[PDB]
Amino acid sequence: MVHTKVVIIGSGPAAHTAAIYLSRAELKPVLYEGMANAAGGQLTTTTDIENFPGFPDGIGGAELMENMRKQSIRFGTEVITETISRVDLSSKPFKLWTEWNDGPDKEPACTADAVIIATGANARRLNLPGEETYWQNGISACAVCDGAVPIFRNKPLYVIGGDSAAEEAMFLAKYGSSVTVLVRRDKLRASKAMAKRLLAHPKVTVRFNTVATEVLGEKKPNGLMTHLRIKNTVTGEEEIVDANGLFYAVGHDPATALVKGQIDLDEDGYIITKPGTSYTSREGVFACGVQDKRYRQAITSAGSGCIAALEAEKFIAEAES
Amino acid sequence: VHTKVVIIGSPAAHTAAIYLSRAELKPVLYEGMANQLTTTTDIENFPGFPDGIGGAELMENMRKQSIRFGTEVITETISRVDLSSKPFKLWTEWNDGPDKEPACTADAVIIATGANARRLNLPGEETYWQNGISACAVCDGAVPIFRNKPLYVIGGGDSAAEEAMFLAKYGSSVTVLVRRDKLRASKAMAKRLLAHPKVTVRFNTVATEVLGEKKPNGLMTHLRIKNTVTGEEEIVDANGLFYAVGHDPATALVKGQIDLDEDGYIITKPGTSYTSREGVFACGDVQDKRYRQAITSAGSGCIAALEAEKFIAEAES
Ligand SMILES: Cc1cc2nc3c(=O)[nH]c(=O)nc-3n(C[C@H](O)[C@H](O)[C@H](O)COP(=O)(O)OP(=O)(O)OC[C@H]3O[C@@H](n4cnc5c(N)ncnc54)[C@H](O)[C@@H]3O)c2cc1C
Ligand SMILES: Cc1cc2nc3c(=O)[nH]c(=O)nc-3n(C[C@H](O)[C@H](O)[C@H](O)COP(=O)(O)OP(=O)(O)OC[C@H]3O[C@@H](n4cnc5c(N)ncnc54)[C@H](O)[C@@H]3O)c2cc1C
């Protein structure tokens, strides 16, 4: 609003959990779920989520984020579907503008004594042909999230060069019949340990200089990905192979462009906060859910969002006189 | 018997077991017939359930999910554990003799035995538990049965003052019953307390009897307190009571094998589940002290599950 108590940025699970706790505490939090730069939590793209506690028969990420939003709005979180353009973490009240409403002379869209960050760190997508067709119907980015799906059990699994690829491929090896790793360039970017225990792992091969040209599959309602046209890049040699599952592993892009140094970041881009909390490099502003790069999960993000809400309340208690 | 990774405890422990069994391991989960959300009647503070879910139903859903993904859930208490050898030895309750054999040893082990808030065993506590009584205010604060109504809190530590200053955001008048003449809390916490408008502190007073509606689904209405110095008991209008004394962490089975803090909780590398001993992880309320929440507990359990998967992968290669 004109001046709120606390503002949370992002549509993610962390943001909605923090908003649940903050609206429970009667703190009147505002939540900016944006207009990805997806609509709703970045988890909505997942067709079904079975690794979240409390849902033994799985649950669609779309309706799960819808339920979290309904919880937040029921508790009193004023959620507005607007993207945040610019932040001003310099004045004592944190001011934030809206995309297409930004301006050096334009008044801020919302100011608050504290701001929680859960803008998400969505894994990069290759925007391949067929990706928008078989998205989460055989094409994913987290192996710990879609590895146990029966459509990948004892089936050829292909993964596109950082360590984020091997950490998931040596795990997918516990399901598919043959896991193959497609590297854009010869050799492995990852440190020597994962490459050593990966090339020596018997259920996974590493095809260097090979990138997937296109993603082929069925063409029916909820059609599954069946094959992958991959192109060896030293001979321009295109070749279509059996691939029931494709897993993206290019480096995740955390949405930390708003801070631009107001809060301080790491080399990979993520927001640096104290371990096990949400206290950023600056008081008042806390980041949760952006927070993690080693686990990259929605339950951990929800826990860190609860953490951010609790620490936000703890801080608001001290600021009030 | 022998398994991949053993998980001690009954939400984070279930979350760790879900993630372990999903990764196609052999994770034995020990609920124990032993030695907490199921005590909670209704839970609105959990995400994804806007209309709320009972703690018993939530834990039953988590349990059937875990046993669906492939965890050998065994309703047996773990008594003693010998973390000396490279494989970790465990022992069942009443089956933990010094010469007795380990029930289900494993290579790695997750700890999520929780940290239970101390109860008072007052007359009627069992009768009116979670129908007015509770232990976490952040969990049962915004419940409509407490808003704009008298609330009484028992405790002497900083947690009691924090819970009272949190509950002042709903009830008409919050009262705290210190068992002694002075506050065990810090000076800043006590200053923010006594300066908080809606809180009232009564020293040398312990709640003696919880007296509410003995209706088939009755709530709590009144509380017989007593000035512990004089012994003069007095029954006051208490719509909602809150245990806010210290919490007992069920780490007793570790017994110094893993480094512990002064309050008893298992120390961990911040932001992780790693313990002092490399190979055993601790998650949930055992390693969490500032939050005590079930969602944060399940998050820490997922942390422990992923780090144990990584550790058991790095061990055999
Ligand atoms: C294909 C894929 C599949 C996955 N499957 C699973 C799974 O099955 N189970 C699981 O637990 N995890 C899964 N994950 C992990 C997923 O990223 C989780 O959502 C993440 O761990 C937690 O999300 P978050 O809290 O970081 O916020 P996010 O979910 O990433 O929320 C991002 C939101 O931030 C908003 N935003 C960004 N910038 C702004 C801004 N300036 N102003 C306003 N809003 C902004 C965007 O609108 C976007 O909606 C998957 C990830 C990917 C890429
Ligand atoms: C009245 C009350 C209300 C609450 N309401 C909420 C709420 O609304 N929302 C929320 O998020 N949190 C709530 N909580 C917090 C609650 O305690 C959470 O469930 C807690 O944070 C989770 O703890 P845990 O996962 O670490 O272990 P828990 O699952 O809570 O308990 C660990 C289990 O380990 C078992 N165990 C111990 N030793 C052994 C052994 N040797 N062998 C086998 N098993 C053993 C014990 O039987 C115990 O049940 C509430 C707590 C209380 C007291």
Verbal overview:
2 copies of one chain form a homodimer. In chain A, strand 12 (225-232) and strand 13 form a beta hairpin. The longest helix of chain A has 22 residues, at 298-319. In chain A, strands 1, 2, 3, 4, 5, 6 and 15 form a 7-stranded mixed beta sheet that branches. In chain A, strands 7-14-8-9-10 form a 5-stranded parallel beta sheet, covered by helices on one side. The first copy, chain A, is built from 6 helices and 15 strands. Chain A is of the alpha/beta class and 321 residues long. Chain A has a domain at 131-248: 3-Layer(bba) Sandwich (FAD/NAD(P)-binding domain). Chain A has helices spanning 13-24, 61-75, 143-146, 163-172, 192-199, 298-319, and strands at residues 3-9, 29-32, 78-80, 84-88, 94-98, 110-117, 139-140, 156-159, 178-182, 204-207, 210-217, 225-232, 237-242, 245-247, 285-287. At the A-B interface, helix 1, helix 2 and helix 6 of A face helix 1, helix 2 and helix 6 of B. The site of one flavin-adenine dinucleotide has 40 residues of chain B, from helix 1, helix 3 and helix 6. Chain A: This is Thioredoxin reductase.
